[PDB]
Amino acid sequence: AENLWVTVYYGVPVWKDAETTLFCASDAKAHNVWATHCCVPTDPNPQE
Amino acid sequence: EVQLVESGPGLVRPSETLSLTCAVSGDSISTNNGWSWIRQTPGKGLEWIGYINGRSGSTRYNPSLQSRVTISTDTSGNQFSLKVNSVTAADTAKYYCAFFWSTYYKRFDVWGPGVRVTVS
Amino acid sequence: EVQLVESGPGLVRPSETLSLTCAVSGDSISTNNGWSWIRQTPGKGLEWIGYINGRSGSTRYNPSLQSRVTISTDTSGNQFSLKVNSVTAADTAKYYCAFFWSTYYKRFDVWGPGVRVTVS
Amino acid sequence: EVQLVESGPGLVRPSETLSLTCAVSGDSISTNNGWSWIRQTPGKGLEWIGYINGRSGSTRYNPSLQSRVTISTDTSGNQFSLKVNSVTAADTAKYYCAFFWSTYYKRFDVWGPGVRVTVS
Amino acid sequence: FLGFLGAAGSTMGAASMTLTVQARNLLSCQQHLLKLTVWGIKQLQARVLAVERYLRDQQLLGIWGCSGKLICCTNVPWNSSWSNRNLSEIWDNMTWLQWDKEISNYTQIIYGLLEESQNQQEKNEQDLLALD
Amino acid sequence: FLGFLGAAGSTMGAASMTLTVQARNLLSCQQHLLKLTVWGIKQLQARVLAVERYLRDQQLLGIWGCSGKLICCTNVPWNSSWSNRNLSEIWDNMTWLQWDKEISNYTQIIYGLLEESQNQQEKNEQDLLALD
Amino acid sequence: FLGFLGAAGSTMGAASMTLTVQARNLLSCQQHLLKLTVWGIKQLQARVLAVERYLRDQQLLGIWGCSGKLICCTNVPWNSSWSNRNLSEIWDNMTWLQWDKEISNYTQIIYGLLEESQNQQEKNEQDLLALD
Amino acid sequence: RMTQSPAILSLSPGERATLSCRASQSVDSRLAWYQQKPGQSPRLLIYDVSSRATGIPDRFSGSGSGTEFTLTISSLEPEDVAVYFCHQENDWPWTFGQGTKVEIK
Amino acid sequence: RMTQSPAILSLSPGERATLSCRASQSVDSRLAWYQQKPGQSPRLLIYDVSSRATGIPDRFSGSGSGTEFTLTISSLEPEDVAVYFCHQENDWPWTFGQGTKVEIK
Amino acid sequence: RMTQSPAILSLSPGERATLSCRASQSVDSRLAWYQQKPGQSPRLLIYDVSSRATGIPDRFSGSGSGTEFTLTISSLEPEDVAVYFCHQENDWPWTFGQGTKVEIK
Ligand SMILES: *[C@@H]1O[C@H](CO[C@@H]2O[C@@H](C)[C@@H](O)[C@@H](O)[C@@H]2O)[C@@H](O[C@@H]2O[C@H](CO)[C@@H](O)[C@H](O)[C@H]2NC(C)=O)[C@H](O)[C@H]1NC(C)=O
Ligand SMILES: *[C@@H]1O[C@H](CO[C@@H]2O[C@@H](C)[C@@H](O)[C@@H](O)[C@@H]2O)[C@@H](O[C@@H]2O[C@H](CO)[C@@H](O)[C@H](O)[C@H]2NC(C)=O)[C@H](O)[C@H]1NC(C)=O
Ligand SMILES: *[C@@H]1O[C@H](CO[C@@H]2O[C@@H](C)[C@@H](O)[C@@H](O)[C@@H]2O)[C@@H](O[C@@H]2O[C@H](CO)[C@@H](O)[C@H](O)[C@H]2NC(C)=O)[C@H](O)[C@H]1NC(C)=O
Ligand SMILES: *[C@@H]1O[C@H](CO)[C@@H](O[C@@H]2O[C@H](CO)[C@@H](O)[C@H](O)[C@H]2NC(C)=O)[C@H](O)[C@H]1NC(C)=O
Ligand SMILES: *[C@@H]1O[C@H](CO)[C@@H](O[C@@H]2O[C@H](CO)[C@@H](O)[C@H](O)[C@H]2NC(C)=O)[C@H](O)[C@H]1NC(C)=O
Ligand SMILES: *[C@@H]1O[C@H](CO)[C@@H](O[C@@H]2O[C@H](CO)[C@@H](O)[C@H](O)[C@H]2NC(C)=O)[C@H](O)[C@H]1NC(C)=O
Ligand SMILES: *[C@@H]1O[C@H](CO)[C@@H](O[C@@H]2O[C@H](CO)[C@@H](O)[C@H](O)[C@H]2NC(C)=O)[C@H](O)[C@H]1NC(C)=O
Ligand SMILES: *[C@@H]1O[C@H](CO)[C@@H](O[C@@H]2O[C@H](CO)[C@@H](O)[C@H](O)[C@H]2NC(C)=O)[C@H](O)[C@H]1NC(C)=O
Ligand SMILES: *[C@@H]1O[C@H](CO)[C@@H](O[C@@H]2O[C@H](CO)[C@@H](O)[C@H](O)[C@H]2NC(C)=O)[C@H](O)[C@H]1NC(C)=O
Ligand SMILES: *[C@@H]1O[C@H](CO)[C@@H](O)[C@H](O)[C@H]1NC(C)=O
Ligand SMILES: *[C@@H]1O[C@H](CO)[C@@H](O)[C@H](O)[C@H]1NC(C)=O
Ligand SMILES: *[C@@H]1O[C@H](CO)[C@@H](O)[C@H](O)[C@H]1NC(C)=O
């Protein structure tokens, strides 16, 4: 007898386990193979 | 739990204004919406007068009373009041202070004992 | 093709109610919208009373008649009717049963002969 | 800069119609919106009558005057006029021709001297 | 990125206030990628997928009649069999992760009903005497 | 996929009831694609195109003022020269494939007019006394 | 492509009439691309980027409550400190390129405020006695 | 609301009738015309200002918009003597004009 | 608006009360019922047609839509003698029915 | 609607005038003030509550929102004797307050 109506929300903080591909990033500062395949810099102050 | 306490003259002469004050206890008027006045008119039943948003000062009134009714809030006293411009015998009624909560998630009323006012 | 047939008292005394029933042939009331009543008032011309959706029971009425008019449907009899609360001589008119189809694709009327009703 | 010039009878008898014409100089009526009539009623103050869009002929009127007032435009003469159906002594007022510009970017008025009209 | 998941432990009601925080974070070299054309593909596949997922959710909000909204009402009644709880048990003292686990099996039933409701609403808009 | 094209032989009027059936189906390994980097591209090109086609149609509905709708009204009058038929000849006893063949040459004329109409409507919204 | 940039020297007010001209132009072999799989990637990267840029702008209009519009009003007041000019100095006798140079540093302040305003508006819609 | 004019149109056989109808407020294009003969329910002639109803001859036409509308009847024949009504559909309550008569002789 | 019926329900102890309320216009489902006892402010029983308020016993129920609504009380006990009111929330002004009485004996 | 107060403001030269205007309903910020001198058409002073019109001196200002609005005049000079009007633009019909007078001596 609640008489409620299924509302819809978008932007809901729900997550599930998943497998995807991660990308590498570096400190910029670093002929080293990992200095070339890890070009994108990370943020100097990661948003934890 | 909010409690509503009311006082004011139980007698107004015709052509004089009417004034009732509702004290609010247990919460802050300035934080909630839905503070309102309703009256019970003999021979007619319950009628809405209007309500005020304590967070803004905006009000809404029953069209039949828009020419005479003022609702306002005392944010220091944590009390609100109803003022009616000159009244007649037709305005004799039991007047009530009430708080109406109506949102997507909850519905409830707080409704005080009221003040009986005779115009004569 | 829908046909509309009407009957009811051609005489109502002042302060008595008025009641007219329209029979529907050729289609189902319960499937279509737009079943309606219109009257032709001498000295004034045609006036809308209101209409009913046979699929829901929802109705709409001319504001001047909202305090007195009821429209409802008999889904067994496949007939619908107009009831008016107490009437006066001012309500003498030719009353008609009509069906109005108005959509994005088609427009048409079915309009029956009506019933002449005198109030006196 | 637009100038507004008005003329018409300063005296109308009760039950006769009222007619005032406003000439427009400095711009084209047919290009702008906001051409309007306002009157100053003794004992009441300023009241809106209505306005016309010179680009379409569409008009809007104050509900209290919808049964009597007509506003229209002469696109040859570059003048517009106010006509009121039969008037009474209650319609004595100073009548004015005005142009109101109100958009997202600009706000301004052009307001002429008006015509004094007595009904008696 | 100031709360990408800050509301995760909040109640369902409280968490309704961060919907723009999660939505704005869901659609966030030089020569290496072309010299070694394995990585150009690995990177493009990740980018294309993020776009496709975004668009599928937007299409559903469109179909259900909720386009452009973060909070949207519908006309589908809630079935008590989907969760036999009252509002004071759902919006308070419960998180969105818990609710999702509770509803999961009924997700497709609900979505199908939302689509049917919008189609019925459109049918009623092509009949000028509708809802009277 | 329960009618992807079920309404194809239906009349134009009847087919108006399946618009969500067609719309929801228009934006539907592992190592092989990277070991043989011909196929990674062949697959991405197919996926990118499906997205671009979807978005171009959505942009037009936006420009014409029909965003979020499957059925939308406009203010552009129908020219009798585009098809000299009445409504009872179009909505009944005719399919959408037949209609498209009949209109085809006038598609761009109509689209241009729809864009002009929306721009005129917007101009009238920046004048607070509009349409009176 | 009949004015892709025709309004660039026009005043801000006059240029408001070409918004559909610029918007419609912002989301416009055979074997070579697969035989030489450097170019397939170079081409896909250009196409994916055009799509991502388009979608980020659409998401912001969504968040700010301006979805589907080319001209949209908000409830955020203009701060005089962002540009101490009156309307007759902005809409007339100034171009959009000049205005952008003048505002630039305040772009993020303004965008943050637009998002806060929409969230406050939504909160007021979950209280049935709102704005009275 | 709206009203019609002339109240009575006394016309020669073969003459064109002109019947106006004027609204105090815009009704867009949602206007219909009806023909009333003795003993009959009203017959629909024209809808949406100018669109002719099924079964209605080409002698009946019309035009107009917003507030100003006209019904015309070409080549009047005695069978066309009737009271013609202007019907407002754009908004509730729907209304009718008072009706005017076209007489032939 | 809306009104209630019967004005007075004279019922036996243990009997089921049926109280109707009828609107002249649709109010959707935005209907609430209140219980009025002497000297008391009105108590909320039911909201949104059928949803029971916190602290209200299962003897109180209801149904309806649009214009036709009903309040029922199962197994009436003397403690249930009260005036019951129908409250319209769908649109402004909010209104009340006249109230009806349920009496037990 | 809305009304103005004081009806008459009798002020010293150099004094600040305060003129209030109160609406029974919110008018948002769509409020304008006008100055009426003998024989003149009304002159616009302030629009959108506080924005000064072109050609108006800095002595004229104002503030307010919703239902409560104020016009102030700094450093009153004899040239400022006039009737001041409050004009409501937010919704139709547009209305005016009764007007009040500022007198200097
Ligand atoms: C609420 O839903 C039930 C049906 O849900 C059942 O469980 C679901 C997980 C899924 O398996 C469904 O397919 C199941 O049917 C509705 O009850 C059904 O109503 C139809 C109506 O004719 C009937 O034919 C079915 O047999 C009913 N199912 C059962 C199990 O009796 C119920 O009506 C829904 N209530 C509301 C308010 O929507
Ligand atoms: C209906 O369209 C005609 C024009 O359509 C013509 O055929 C099309 C396939 C395409 O080739 C068009 O470019 C053609 O012009 C309109 O008639 C035109 O009106 C303009 C107005 O000034 C006039 O200059 C043109 O010469 C006219 N064309 C012709 C052939 O006479 C007609 O007005 C349109 N009707 C409506 C209601 O929009
Ligand atoms: C208009 O903005 C000022 C603040 O803008 C300053 O300059 C910007 C470029 C950026 O650096 C801001 O962070 C700066 O603060 C507002 O003034 C601030 O108001 C807050 C309110 O408490 C106060 O704490 C700050 O110290 C004020 N800043 C200064 C420099 O005094 C001002 O209120 C804004 N006006 C409006 C109408 O929004
Ligand atoms: C984590 O749980 C605690 C309690 O289990 C939450 O703290 C409550 O917060 C509400 C907020 O108004 C308070 O009224 C309660 O009194 C708090 N409880 C206690 C025991 O202090 C806390 O907020 C939860 N964290 C999150 C993110 O919701
Ligand atoms: C939702 O689905 C899950 C499974 O995906 C259901 O849980 C299973 O129910 C069966 C019923 O016999 C059990 O045998 C399984 O062991 C359950 N699995 C788990 C992980 O517990 C769950 O009950 C479903 N929920 C509803 C409401 O139907
Ligand atoms: C294929 O064509 C046949 C007829 O040519 C369609 O059948 C008609 O369907 C309508 C639906 O109400 C009926 O009223 C007609 O009487 C049917 N005609 C006959 C001869 O039976 C059929 O529906 C068409 N198929 C599709 C998909 O439209
Ligand atoms: C739409 O375009 C087609 C061609 O793409 C037109 O058909 C051609 O018309 C020319 C006219 O001289 C003929 O010579 C061709 O043989 C026609 N082609 C075909 C395949 O029949 C068609 O007429 C155009 N339709 C309209 C309405 O203009
Ligand atoms: C380039 O600048 C010139 C003037 O500096 C602009 O010409 C003006 O256009 C307006 C349009 O109504 C006229 O009223 C002015 O009188 C023109 N000025 C002169 C000196 O003729 C011209 O339009 C500008 N170009 C663009 C694209 O805006
Ligand atoms: C917007 O940012 C620019 C720089 O990106 C500011 O200009 C600089 O201001 C500093 C202030 O000391 C000067 O030293 C630089 O030389 C300026 N740069 C240039 C290119 O002139 C600009 O002032 C900022 N605008 C605002 C309104 O803050
Ligand atoms: C539409 O055209 C067809 C063609 O034969 C005709 O039969 C039908 O009656 C027309 N409709 C109307 C309303 O005239
Ligand atoms: C909701 O269910 C809980 C379960 O214990 C109950 O305590 C609460 O009172 C219920 N709410 C209402 C309004 O009955
Ligand atoms: C806007 O600023 C310019 C700057 O010179 C000024 O001339 C103009 O009059 C100002 N507008 C108003 C309305 O004061």
mmCIF file of C-alpha atoms and ligand atoms in Angstrom, chain G residues 81-82 101-106, ligand 9:
data_model
loop_
_atom_site.group_PDB
_atom_site.id
_atom_site.type_symbol
_atom_site.label_atom_id
_atom_site.label_comp_id
_atom_site.label_asym_id
_atom_site.label_seq_id
_atom_site.Cartn_x
_atom_site.Cartn_y
_atom_site.Cartn_z
ATOM 1 C CA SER G 81 34.881 41.910 -10.705
ATOM 2 C CA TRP G 82 34.833 39.557 -13.685
ATOM 3 C CA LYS G 101 40.485 37.338 -23.947
ATOM 4 C CA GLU G 102 38.969 39.575 -21.234
ATOM 5 C CA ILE G 103 37.215 36.766 -19.336
ATOM 6 C CA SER G 104 39.657 33.828 -19.749
ATOM 7 C CA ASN G 105 41.024 33.729 -16.137
ATOM 8 C CA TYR G 106 37.545 33.595 -14.683
HETATM 9 C C1 LIG K 9 44.886 36.411 -16.888
HETATM 10 O O1 LIG K 9 46.149 35.691 -16.969
HETATM 11 C C2 LIG K 9 47.197 36.444 -17.603
HETATM 12 C C3 LIG K 9 48.380 35.508 -17.660
HETATM 13 O O2 LIG K 9 48.097 34.211 -18.160
HETATM 14 C C4 LIG K 9 47.467 37.713 -16.776
HETATM 15 O O3 LIG K 9 48.483 38.538 -17.365
HETATM 16 C C5 LIG K 9 49.688 38.543 -16.626
HETATM 17 O O4 LIG K 9 49.561 39.256 -15.356
HETATM 18 C C6 LIG K 9 50.805 39.250 -14.634
HETATM 19 C C7 LIG K 9 50.573 40.009 -13.352
HETATM 20 O O5 LIG K 9 51.761 40.402 -12.679
HETATM 21 C C8 LIG K 9 51.876 39.938 -15.475
HETATM 22 O O6 LIG K 9 53.108 39.941 -14.773
HETATM 23 C C9 LIG K 9 52.058 39.189 -16.797
HETATM 24 O O7 LIG K 9 53.061 39.810 -17.644
HETATM 25 C C10 LIG K 9 50.747 39.221 -17.491
HETATM 26 N N1 LIG K 9 50.836 38.501 -18.750
HETATM 27 C C11 LIG K 9 50.561 39.071 -19.907
HETATM 28 C C12 LIG K 9 50.635 38.200 -21.120
HETATM 29 O O8 LIG K 9 50.262 40.273 -19.983
HETATM 30 C C13 LIG K 9 46.171 38.527 -16.750
HETATM 31 O O9 LIG K 9 46.336 39.758 -16.006
HETATM 32 C C14 LIG K 9 45.126 37.708 -16.104
HETATM 33 N N2 LIG K 9 43.905 38.487 -16.083
HETATM 34 C C15 LIG K 9 43.225 38.699 -14.985
HETATM 35 C C16 LIG K 9 41.975 39.495 -15.129
HETATM 36 O O10 LIG K 9 43.601 38.262 -13.893
#
